[PDB]
Amino acid sequence: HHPCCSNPCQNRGECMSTGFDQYKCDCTRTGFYGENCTTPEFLTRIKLLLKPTPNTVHYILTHFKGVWNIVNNIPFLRSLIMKYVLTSRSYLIDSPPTYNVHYGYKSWEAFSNLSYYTRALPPVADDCPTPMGVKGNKELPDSKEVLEKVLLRREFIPDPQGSNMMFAFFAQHFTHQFFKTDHKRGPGFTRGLGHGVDLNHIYGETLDRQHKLRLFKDGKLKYQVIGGEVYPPTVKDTQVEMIYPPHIPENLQFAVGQEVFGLVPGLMMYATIWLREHNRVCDILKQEHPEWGDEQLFQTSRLILIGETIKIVIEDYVQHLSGYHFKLKFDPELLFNQQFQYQNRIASEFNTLYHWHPLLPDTFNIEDQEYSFKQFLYNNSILLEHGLTQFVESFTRQIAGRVAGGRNVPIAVQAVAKASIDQSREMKYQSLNEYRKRFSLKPYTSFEELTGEKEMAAELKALYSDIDVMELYPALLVEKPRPDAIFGETMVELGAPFSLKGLMGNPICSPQYWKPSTFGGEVGFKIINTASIQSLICNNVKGCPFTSFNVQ
Amino acid sequence: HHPCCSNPCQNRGECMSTGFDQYKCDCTRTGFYGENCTTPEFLTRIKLLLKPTPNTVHYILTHFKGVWNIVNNIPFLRSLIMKYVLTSRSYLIDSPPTYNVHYGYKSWEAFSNLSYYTRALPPVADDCPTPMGVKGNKELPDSKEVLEKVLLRREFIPDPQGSNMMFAFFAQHFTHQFFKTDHKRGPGFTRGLGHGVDLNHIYGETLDRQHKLRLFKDGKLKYQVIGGEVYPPTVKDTQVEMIYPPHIPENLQFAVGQEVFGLVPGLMMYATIWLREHNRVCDILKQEHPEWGDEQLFQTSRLILIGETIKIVIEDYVQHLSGYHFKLKFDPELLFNQQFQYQNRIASEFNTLYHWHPLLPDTFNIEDQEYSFKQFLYNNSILLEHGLTQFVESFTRQIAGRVAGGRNVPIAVQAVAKASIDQSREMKYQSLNEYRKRFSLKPYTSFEELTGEKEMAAELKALYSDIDVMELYPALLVEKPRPDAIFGETMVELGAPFSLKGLMGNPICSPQYWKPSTFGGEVGFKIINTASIQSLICNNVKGCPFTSFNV
Ligand code: COH
Numbered sequence A: 001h002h003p004c005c006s007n008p009c010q011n012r013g014e015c016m017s018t019g020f021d022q023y024k025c026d027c028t029r030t031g032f033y034g035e036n037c038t039t040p041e042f043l044t045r046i047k048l049l050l051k052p053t054p055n056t057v058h059y060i061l062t063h064f065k066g067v068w069n070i071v072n073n074i075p076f077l078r079s080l081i082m083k084y085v086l087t088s089r090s091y092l093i094d095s096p097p098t099y100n101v102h103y104g105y106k107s108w109e110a111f112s113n114l115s116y117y118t119r120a121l122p123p124v125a126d127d128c129p130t131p132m133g134v135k136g137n138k139e140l141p142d143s144k145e146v147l148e149k150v151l152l153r154r155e156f157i158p159d160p161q162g163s164n165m166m167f168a169f170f171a172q173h174f175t176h177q178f179f180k181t182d183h184k185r186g187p188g189f190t191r192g193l194g195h196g197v198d199l200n201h202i203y204g205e206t207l208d209r210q211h212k213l214r215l216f217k218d219g220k221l222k223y224q225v226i227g228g229e230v231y232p233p234t235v236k237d238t239q240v241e242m243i244y245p246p247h248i249p250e251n252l253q254f255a256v257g258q259e260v261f262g263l264v265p266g267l268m269m270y271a272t273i274w275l276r277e278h279n280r281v282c283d284i285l286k287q288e289h290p291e292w293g294d295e296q297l298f299q300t301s302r303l304i305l306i307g308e309t310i311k312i313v314i315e316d317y318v319q320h321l322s323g324y325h326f327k328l329k330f331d332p333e334l335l336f337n338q339q340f341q342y343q344n345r346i347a348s349e350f351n352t353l354y355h356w357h358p359l360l361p362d363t364f365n366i367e368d369q370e371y372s373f374k375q376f377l378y379n380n381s382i383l384l385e386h387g388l389t390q391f392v393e394s395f396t397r398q399i400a401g402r403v404a405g406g407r408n409v410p411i412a413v414q415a416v417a418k419a420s421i422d423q424s425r426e427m428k429y430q431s432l433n434e435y436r437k438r439f440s441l442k443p444y445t446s447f448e449e450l451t452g453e454k455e456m457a458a459e460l461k462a463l464y465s466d467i468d469v470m471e472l473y474p475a476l477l478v479e480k481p482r483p484d485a486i487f488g489e490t491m492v493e494l495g496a497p498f499s500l501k502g503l504m505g506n507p508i509c510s511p512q513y514w515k516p517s518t519f520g521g522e523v524g525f526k527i528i529n530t531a532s533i534q535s536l537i538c539n540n541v542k543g544c545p546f547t548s549f550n551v552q
Numbered sequence B: 001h002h003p004c005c006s007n008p009c010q011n012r013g014e015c016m017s018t019g020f021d022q023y024k025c026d027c028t029r030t031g032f033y034g035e036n037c038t039t040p041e042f043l044t045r046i047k048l049l050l051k052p053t054p055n056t057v058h059y060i061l062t063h064f065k066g067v068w069n070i071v072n073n074i075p076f077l078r079s080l081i082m083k084y085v086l087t088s089r090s091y092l093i094d095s096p097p098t099y100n101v102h103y104g105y106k107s108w109e110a111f112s113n114l115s116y117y118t119r120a121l122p123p124v125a126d127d128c129p130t131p132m133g134v135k136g137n138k139e140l141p142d143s144k145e146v147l148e149k150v151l152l153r154r155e156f157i158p159d160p161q162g163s164n165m166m167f168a169f170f171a172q173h174f175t176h177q178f179f180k181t182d183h184k185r186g187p188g189f190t191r192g193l194g195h196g197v198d199l200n201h202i203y204g205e206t207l208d209r210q211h212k213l214r215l216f217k218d219g220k221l222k223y224q225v226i227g228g229e230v231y232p233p234t235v236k237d238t239q240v241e242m243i244y245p246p247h248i249p250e251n252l253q254f255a256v257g258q259e260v261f262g263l264v265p266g267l268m269m270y271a272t273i274w275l276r277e278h279n280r281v282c283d284i285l286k287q288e289h290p291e292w293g294d295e296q297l298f299q300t301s302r303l304i305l306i307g308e309t310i311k312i313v314i315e316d317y318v319q320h321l322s323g324y325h326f327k328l329k330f331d332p333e334l335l336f337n338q339q340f341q342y343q344n345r346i347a348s349e350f351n352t353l354y355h356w357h358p359l360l361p362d363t364f365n366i367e368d369q370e371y372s373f374k375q376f377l378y379n380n381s382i383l384l385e386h387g388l389t390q391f392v393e394s395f396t397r398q399i400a401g402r403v404a405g406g407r408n409v410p411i412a413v414q415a416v417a418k419a420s421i422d423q424s425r426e427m428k429y430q431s432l433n434e435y436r437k438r439f440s441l442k443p444y445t446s447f448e449e450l451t452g453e454k455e456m457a458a459e460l461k462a463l464y465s466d467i468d469v470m471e472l473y474p475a476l477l478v479e480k481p482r483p484d485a486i487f488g489e490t491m492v493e494l495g496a497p498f499s500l501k502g503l504m505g506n507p508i509c510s511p512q513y514w515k516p517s518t519f520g521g522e523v524g525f526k527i528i529n530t531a532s533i534q535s536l537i538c539n540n541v542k543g544c545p546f547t548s549f550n551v
């Protein structure tokens, strides 16, 4: 078997076989040396002694509200702290990207082929004696057993951070522009070739789909008006392919950028909101530029909405998730004197960690109604019946589920949760502890340390035998949460660097793009730099209902 | 018409229409302000006070041979100077890229669509009163007249830098991996979706083609043996599509990564050499790694060859072009403490400026023969008859033409030269002087200043009227060359930033790739770092004939 199977090289050293039974570690720029890159250099030793843990930093950021109130209201300090936040999480992602499901060594095929998700850790070699390399049993535990024992919801566990359904559906809508698994090829392949925030879930992945969705007047997207309300156009009107069961009425077959968004009214709510936002921005730009044609109006509005998206994601969405008292800031300028690569490749593991199915409630409560999963799926008539105003009001008030802490995956989606485990295995993912080390975290030394409790930890000990072969996906959903938090440490520490790269790596954040003229002038630039989840709803939903990512 | 037609915004300021009859300039980060971004900020004044011109910097680098000999022998000083060379040429290229032939404004379509060549300057708007904007006549001079008066060769003008046929064919072979115009779509579109040094001209652009070219044993590429000599396989053997005239016999239809390389025997020479290089590196890696399979051997060899290519291009090719006494260095580590984007998009203007057809001789002289263009083209039996060793020996001694200085485009390729002008106009290229300012060069104030002589200048004045509507491409071929040099100022100052971006922008130059393990360990890494035009030939050509890009 491959001599690197045991993952002998530490501290980001790279393993290479040098014969049938021998390996060499490449310790270049790791700050360590010796056979396994475990002997620290002098400066590294001092740097390690001075580095606070993620849990300590989290503590500081979630306490001393008095201090953060001063910091937030002093622009120079806020920018300084945000610059720290951005740069500290930056160095953790390979960019240009390296490994993928088929390549555990760097290659031009892995670099150049955009159809792959990239990989933060190489796959376990095909000939390793155990699924995780050399540790553990010949087989991993039955995925159904892991699922039922420690993942499935017994009783609904609410998010103590107060995340609502506006948040849950934003997460699903937003991420599905870049997590678009090519099931025809396999779980390691993506259909989102833009690899980030390109708003293809609104505009379509291909030029052909985009043009079918456009009005070709005033830069606008096609639409219909049902009972005086603007909705996306239909499949029949556009010839835009969507996924719908055969029994869905023609006018309820809405066509949008992402083919799967007819799946739930929660996604269609946001699809409709963003469609309206695009056309509203078109109106503004037409007023500013009566001399512009349809093509420039369309393209400029798209860039503006990309900006709006990144703004909202950082300052509202991530802000909410973080629980920080410090106010995070979207400001591309903070990186202009820093070293940063304006590019991104979506990581398979980023997709995996983002399977936040515990967010889902047992029922979807709109107005006076409480809809089951069966009633809610593929049912746009619910959206039209209640209207967007009621949707916002109800979703803002409805609590979402806790993601970490265990046993909160709704039974309705048990198959999807099982698929996350099975596909992790197909893609030959390394263990939880290997991923912890890859992101500068201390490996867990017991199952009890992972969960912070006794019962689930005992089930996992009996299932897996060794903490060193515990798997990433199930660990993220059973991990002990931060105090009164939605997530454990591992979720935040892997998630945040991937998120940063996807957000700040966008071309619009680069110096040659981050200029008023890029966005049709100061008016267009202002739309971006003042966007909020509240202004989004206020501008595009009748009655301007209050909204938030938290129930409060 | 478009209010930006006159290109009012100076110093990298962006023009935007604000109503039918009005514009506004965006002066963000240009170091200037005011309506047209022409009022310098204080620090900019001090910068513009100290900054030497490209001409004086060239002088310094091409004189004081004694001082440079000392400098070249102190690694720290050599590193420091090479770092300056790299970083000064950096800020000039938009990366991530911006404009293209269809987009005079930034758009997601322009950013995300890799089928386009990008544009260093946006196209002139479709409704502008004159081809260049507002200046000059309603029509540009007949391109046939421009070609005949100032471009076409009378007497052959040899390159005073002593560039040879090894250099001319290397230039053609190397650049045709990233200049691959998609004629089906138009001159502003490319088939080279990797946009740089990916060696698709050896391995194929698509995975299907690569797989047809590969042996699937020992990481190797398919080949044939003719008279004990290794050549590329046939179209018949591989099912790899190539461009050949119908009369070319099956045995002479060589299959290589780039579809057009069978059309010129000098291109097939390098295709053969590099194919041999790949299989040689496979042999070396296989004895370093007896445990490795075909796939890893192949992929690692490709990466090594990409590194060899960049090494040779900087240290032999650009070195020769530059005429510098300073020894240029390929060292990715020089940028590790610098702000630099490891990405590239091929610019249409880079393609345009690389149309060095004055380089081509009147005849191709191999051994005792002198082949006309008609005899040379599509004729790979010449390669087989003479052999690679003779090709190298002959091409090493045969001198190429001077590119700048005017009147040196061989008659045989007059239609291609005319196409370069016509396609520049089709793509709505801005003027020579607009491009000069874009690259921090002073505009030319007269045709005489451009050419450094009287006769061609007078012809161009009669054809164009105003120096400010002179076109970029013909200007590069008629421009006053540097003293005893192959090129003038505009060629170098536009060419060098596009070049170093394509070379250093490659992912293998990034910190996570630039490590011995990426290349199979220290042996594979050393192959890259010791590669030269001479070693390429010596390792792969019977007899190890002597070679270089000069003489
Ligand atoms: C962000 C949290 C989140 C939520 C709230 C959510 C809500 C729901 C939901 C109820 C509204 C249902 C019925 C499903 C059902 C599915 N989910 Co999500 N999912 C979520 C995160 C994800 C992610 C991330 C993926 C991977 C997408 C991919 O790779 O295509 C996913 C994959 C899936 C897939 C298979 C991928 C595909 O074919 O596109 C199904 C089916 N699911 N999910």
Ligand code: COH
Pocket (backbone or CB within 6 Å): B168, B169, B171, B172, B175, B179, B180, B181, B264, B266, B351, B354, B355, B356, B357, B359, B360, B413, B416, B419, B420
């Ligand atoms: C770098 C120097 C160089 C040399 C030595 C060279 C040598 C030769 C040569 C003799 C061996 C012949 C017969 C040709 C003939 C041609 N060249 Co060049 N070419 C060169 C640089 C280029 C470049 C660059 C292009 C554009 C390639 C593209 O865009 O596909 C080109 C394009 C062409 C075309 C396509 C026509 C068009 O409209 O662009 C023809 C035909 N030619 N060339």
Ligand SMILES: *[C@@H]1O[C@H](CO)[C@@H](O[C@@H]2O[C@H](CO)[C@@H](O[C@H]3O[C@H](CO)[C@@H](O)[C@H](O)[C@@H]3O)[C@H](O)[C@H]2NC(C)=O)[C@H](O)[C@H]1NC(C)=O
Pocket (backbone or CB within 6 Å): A113, A115, A116, A184, A185, B206, B207, B208
């Ligand atoms: C990016 O990587 C993908 C995975 O390798 C690749 O898809 C694969 O493409 C190859 C070659 O095009 C297909 O193999 C085919 O080749 C011959 C036909 O003569 C047969 O042996 C096979 O049956 C098959 O038809 C693979 O099927 C395919 N693999 C998949 C879909 O998983 C993409 O082509 C790569 N993309 C780019 C741009 O290179």
Ligand SMILES: *[C@@H]1O[C@H](CO)[C@@H](O[C@@H]2O[C@H](CO)[C@@H](O)[C@H](O)[C@H]2NC(C)=O)[C@H](O)[C@H]1NC(C)=O
Pocket (backbone or CB within 6 Å): A006, A008, A034, A035, A036, A038
């Ligand atoms: C580098 O790692 C290797 C293999 O992981 C180490 O070898 C192990 O050493 C430990 C001692 O703590 C033993 O428990 C194992 O039996 C060894 N495993 C194998 C397969 O050799 C090696 O000692 C490490 N090298 C250094 C210099 O620390």
Ligand SMILES: *[C@@H]1O[C@H](CO)[C@@H](O[C@@H]2O[C@H](CO)[C@@H](O)[C@H](O)[C@H]2NC(C)=O)[C@H](O)[C@H]1NC(C)=O
Pocket (backbone or CB within 6 Å): B006, B008, B034, B035, B036, B038
């Ligand atoms: C900015 O540039 C514009 C256009 O080049 C200048 O306006 C022109 O100036 C010339 C000479 O002064 C006039 O003859 C034209 O009538 C103007 N053309 C126009 C307005 O389209 C303008 O002077 C420059 N502005 C500044 C502040 O220097």
Ligand SMILES: *[C@@H]1O[C@H](CO)[C@@H](O[C@@H]2O[C@H](CO)[C@@H](O)[C@H](O)[C@H]2NC(C)=O)[C@H](O)[C@H]1NC(C)=O
Pocket (backbone or CB within 6 Å): A206, A207, A208, B113, B115, B116, B184, B185
């Ligand atoms: C990049 O741009 C080109 C030019 O617009 C696109 O090619 C066009 O695609 C449309 C719609 O599918 C076709 O009707 C035309 O035949 C194409 N025009 C051509 C060939 O010039 C191309 O699809 C774009 N690439 C991507 C990935 O969207």
Ligand SMILES: CCCCC/C=C\C/C=C\C/C=C\C/C=C\CCCC(=O)O
Pocket (backbone or CB within 6 Å): A085, A086, A089, A175, A313, A318, A321, A322, A487, A491, A492, A494, A495, A496, A497, A498, A499, A500, A501, A502, A503
């Ligand atoms: C570095 C960029 C912003 C800094 C973020 C700082 C702290 C983040 C705090 C909590 C984030 C929690 C989980 C992250 C998981 C996915 C990221 C979601 C955002 C996205 O889908 O993109």
Ligand SMILES: CCCCC/C=C\C/C=C\C/C=C\C/C=C\CCCC(=O)O
Pocket (backbone or CB within 6 Å): B085, B089, B178, B195, B196, B197, B313, B318, B321, B322, B344, B346, B491, B492, B495, B496, B498, B499, B500, B501, B502, B503
């Ligand atoms: C497209 C990516 C590939 C990069 C292209 C590589 C080489 C092109 C070579 C030369 C371009 C034309 C003129 C500049 C040449 C010599 C001047 C010295 C350059 C320097 O002192 O720096």
Ligand SMILES: CCCCCCCCO[C@@H]1O[C@H](CO)[C@@H](O)[C@H](O)[C@H]1O
Pocket (backbone or CB within 6 Å): A148, A149, A152, A153, A154, A411, A455, A456, A459
């Ligand atoms: C409720 C959703 C399906 C559950 C599948 C039952 C599998 C048995 O799982 C058991 O569940 C018990 C109750 O939570 C736990 O106390 C045990 O530790 C666990 O083994």
Ligand SMILES: CCCCCCCCO[C@@H]1O[C@H](CO)[C@@H](O)[C@H](O)[C@H]1O
Pocket (backbone or CB within 6 Å): B148, B149, B152, B153, B154, B411, B414
């Ligand atoms: C020795 C020829 C040098 C060219 C000097 C400029 C005059 C060119 O004259 C033109 O030359 C073309 C190519 O020969 C011909 O196709 C044209 O018919 C001819 O008019």
Ligand SMILES: *[C@@H]1O[C@H](CO)[C@@H](O)[C@H](O)[C@H]1NC(C)=O
Pocket (backbone or CB within 6 Å): A374, A375, A376, A379, A381, A382, A383, A385
């Ligand atoms: C869809 O929603 C409507 C109300 O809008 C409801 O009457 C119906 O039961 C739902 N359809 C299904 C199949 O559950």
Ligand SMILES: *[C@@H]1O[C@H](CO)[C@@H](O)[C@H](O)[C@H]1NC(C)=O
Pocket (backbone or CB within 6 Å): B374, B375, B376, B379, B381, B382, B385
């Ligand atoms: C091709 O070259 C050979 C010399 O090897 C010569 O005999 C033949 O005439 C050439 N063919 C053409 C069409 O010029």
